[PDB]
Paper text:
The PCDN family is a lineage of antibodies isolated from an individual participant in the International AIDS Vaccine Initiative’s (IAVI) Protocol C, a longitudinal study of neutralization breadth in HIV-infected individuals. The donor in question, PC76, developed a broad serum response targeting the N332-glycan supersite (also known as the high-mannose patch), one of the key epitopes on Env, which involves N-linked glycans and amino-acid residues around the base of the hypervariable region 3 (V3) loop. All thirteen of these antibodies have a cysteine (Cys) residue at position 100 k, which is located at the base of CDRH3. One PTM that has been less frequently discussed in the context of therapeutic antibodies is cysteinylation, in which a cysteine residue in the antibody forms a disulfide with a free cysteine molecule.
Mass spectra of species from the ion exchange chromatogram of this variant were difficult to interpret due to the presence of two potential N-linked glycosylation sites (HAsn26 and LAsn70) within the Fab domain. The crystal structure of PCDN-38B also showed evidence for cysteinylation. The cystine of this antibody, however, displays weaker electron density than observed in PCDN-16B that may partially result from multiple alternate conformations exhibited by the cysteine adduct here. Based on the electron density that was observed in the omit map, we determined the cystine conformation with highest occupancy, and modeled it into the crystal structure. Optimum definition of the refined electron density was found at around 60% occupancy of the adduct, but we decided not to model any other alternate conformations due to low confidence in their positions. For the most occupied cystine conformation in PCDN-38B, the disulfide bond formed to Cys100k adopts a very similar conformation to the cystine of PCDN-16B as shown by the dihedral angles between atoms Cα—Cβ—S—S’, where S’ represents the sulfur of the adduct. However, the dihedral angles over the S’—Cβ’—Cα’—N’ atoms (all on the cysteine adduct) indicate an overall rotation of the acetamido group by approximately 57° in the two structures. In addition to electron density corresponding to the cysteine adduct, we also see some ordered density for both expected N-linked glycans in Fab 38B. In the PCDN-38B crystal structure, the difference between B-values of the adduct and protein atoms is considerably larger (70 and 41 Å2, respectively); however, the average B-value of the N-linked glycans is 75 Å2, which is similar to that of the cysteine adduct. As such, we cannot say whether the crystal structure represents the 52,927-Da major peak, the 52,888-Da population (the putative cysteinylated version of the 52,770-Da peak), or some other species.
Residue numbers in the entry:
A (entry chain A): -1 to 27, 27A, 28 to 94, 96 to 214
B (entry chain B): 1 to 82, 82A, 82B, 82C, 83 to 100, 100A, 100B, 100C, ...
Amino acid sequence: VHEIVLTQSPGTLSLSPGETASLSCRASQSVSDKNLAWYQQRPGLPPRLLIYGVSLKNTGVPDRFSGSGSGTNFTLTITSLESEDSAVYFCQQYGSSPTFGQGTKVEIKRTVAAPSVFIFPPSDEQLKSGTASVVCLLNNFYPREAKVQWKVDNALQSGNSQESVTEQDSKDSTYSLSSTLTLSKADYEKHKVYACEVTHQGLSSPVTKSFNRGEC
Amino acid sequence: QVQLQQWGTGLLKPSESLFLTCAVYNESMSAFSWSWIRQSADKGLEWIGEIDHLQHVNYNPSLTGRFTISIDTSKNQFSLRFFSVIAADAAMYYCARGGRKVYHAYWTGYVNNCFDPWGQGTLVTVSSASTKGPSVFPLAPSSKSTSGGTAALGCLVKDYFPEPVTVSWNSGALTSGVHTFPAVLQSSGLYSLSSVVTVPSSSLGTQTYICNVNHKPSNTKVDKRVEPKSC
Ligand SMILES: *[C@@H]1O[C@H](CO[C@@H]2O[C@@H](C)[C@@H](O)[C@@H](O)[C@@H]2O)[C@@H](O[C@@H]2O[C@H](CO)[C@@H](O[C@@H]3O[C@H](CO[C@H]4O[C@H](CO)[C@@H](O)[C@H](O)[C@@H]4O)[C@@H](O)[C@H](O)[C@@H]3O)[C@H](O)[C@H]2NC(C)=O)[C@H](O)[C@H]1NC(C)=O
Ligand SMILES: *[C@@H]1O[C@H](CO)[C@@H](O)[C@H](O)[C@H]1NC(C)=O
């Protein structure tokens, strides 16, 4: 026995609500009978079975989810897209030893939403520990593309910060981003102005949130 | 309602043995096949193997020999044991209900070997580094206005290992507007994440805001109140 590789295309799909999503699942060799399933996965949760037997829906799956195909070509069709359909979808065959596709991420488009930007100075608790973390929050924005620039006394920071982004919210279809600039307490106290400059197409101009260290 | 509950130790050193157990509620073990599945960033979803009530198994051919699956038909539990883990075994491990049994003349088979429902998952980390509990630092809002209508506050859960940590707010009473971000692996090998929430700026003086941080690998549990910062 060997593993049948499943290739899903495209890797990412971005469509507006009400449109129809078409997700492909190609098999390296023929899948016998109708031994293919489809799953939907959200962050922090196991995959959720949507379709089994190529076209049979699971309990609670709406009629707008439909599957088809045979042999080596299978398709998952989602009509009347909704915000909660923002997720990653996997196909899985069980004609041989079970294997999964790599997944297709579905982003649901929405109106442009500029980020609300917040900067956070290091806490006094952390400063006692000898370290200083400065955090910049970009809250509830769309599209995903955004630029965050740290400036320390107008010095552009490059390679000194880390960021992470939430998956698209299933209700309002926005993203949020958190960026952390970490310095030692000694280096933190060498400078005064700590600024976070955010660029996003929802903003008419870049927004800067800043504070002066030790002026409180 | 059929429910799968799983447990087991997630952090272990290389060449150590992984052992996970999955309890099946509201279902007979002899009515379905029972599979183990893992999910990693490098390999995606990987079916590991399956077992039935007759203790017959079928294993992933790429992983055969490295593990064994057992079943306890009287206690409605089945387990997965990797004999000696390697770094590439780090992943989220799930148990799931697989194919449904069909009765034939003189034998029984299984059809539709898909997975529903699933266990909640057990995150497995393969590392020789010791466990470390995080420090919880406030992301304090300003007493003055940072945006007139809406303020943001949060907690910085910094320098812990390994994943995962859980964060709630006000013991679950506050969920609206909460964003708990994916952790980042710092250059020191320790993880750090933030959890924030946007609230009405008028509530900063009256409403108490507490983040509930739990890092079970180190048994570090912290309730940190976040206060406005005044000057
Ligand atoms: C496992 O799943 C069952 C439910 O699934 C059913 O039972 C299993 C064993 C299988 O046979 C399945 O095929 C079935 O579908 C859960 O058990 C049920 O739990 C609920 C509670 O969440 C029970 O409901 C309670 O009923 C109480 C008594 O009701 C009486 O009074 C009301 C009001 O007067 C009346 O309307 C009713 O007709 C009764 O006369 C009630 O006081 C209470 O508030 C609650 O409503 C239900 O009865 C349970 N079903 C059975 C068959 O026991 C298990 O919780 C679940 N276990 C796990 C571990 O997940
Ligand atoms: C696979 O199916 C899709 C739609 O179901 C079709 O557009 C595509 O051409 C097919 N590809 C092959 C190789 O048959």
